[PDB]
Amino acid sequence: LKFEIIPQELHARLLDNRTQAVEELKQLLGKFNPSSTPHASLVGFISLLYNLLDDSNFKVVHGTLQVLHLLVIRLGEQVQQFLGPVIAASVKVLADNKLVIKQEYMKIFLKLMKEVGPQRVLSLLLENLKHKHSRVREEVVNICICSLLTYPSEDFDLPKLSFDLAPALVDSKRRVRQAALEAFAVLASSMGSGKTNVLFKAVDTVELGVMNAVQARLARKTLPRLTEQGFVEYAILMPS
């Protein structure tokens, strides 16, 4: 058993129709206890999954993401030990503009937030606002929105959050900016109106136009919402 989990024949089929192999792997994961598995082996396994997400075939990527989700599930608290790797793995597939993919990585990120708390997840994740793929940036912002709609205000450091998100307000790409304005509407709602002042300071750190769009958005007292699938639906397309 490779990594104490995978039969060498399945491993060989995974590394050399990868999709069937991947689903076989999922089956094996079904009844598996990583609390009985040495750390080094779990590191190996996760490394393998990370490589499988490099596949050109999105169905392999999808199946691997399902395996990763299940692993995260089985792990429980132990996920805390692998927060970094699992988040790098999940950020990789954010460039992939496919709904089946997004289903799986949204499942993963929500599980992560459930296990180690939303703020941790989001700070790690928000470092990827400097990522060169604009869909990565866009989805970072949407996962933040999802987080702020799933968890109460006090689970978050909202000033920190708005300062970390303010650069998306001036992103070169329209979709990232639209995402960031929705996020700012949710921040305004979560701070309560007696503290929007900090949001305007956040806007000051990236512009000193954006002010006008932010105010226009905030004046619209409507918020995005979450689908059952955990996707964000936007409240409004600002003419901007």
In angstroms, the CA 142 to CA 125 distance is: 11
Map residue 125 onto helix, strand or coil: helix
Amino acid identity, residue 150? T
Token pair, residue 76, equals 């429980």
- 210: helix, coil or strand? helix
What residues contact residue 33 under an 8 Å CB cut-off, 6+ apart?
74
Do 142 and 180 touch, CB atoms closer than 8 A? no
Could you give the residue ranges of the DSSP H alpha helices within the chain?
8-15, 18-30, 39-52, 58-75, 83-92, 99-116, 118-126, 134-150, 158-165, 174-191, 197-204, 210-219
Separation of alpha carbons 62 and 190, rounded Å: 34
Grouping H, G, I as helix, E, B as strand and the rest as coil, residue 67 is: helix
Cβ distance 85 to 46 under 8 Å?
Answer: yes
Enumerate domains of the chain plus CATH numbers. 1-240 (1.25.10.10)
Handedness of CA 204, 206, 207, 212 (dihedral sign): negative
Which resolution in angstroms does this entry have? 2.2
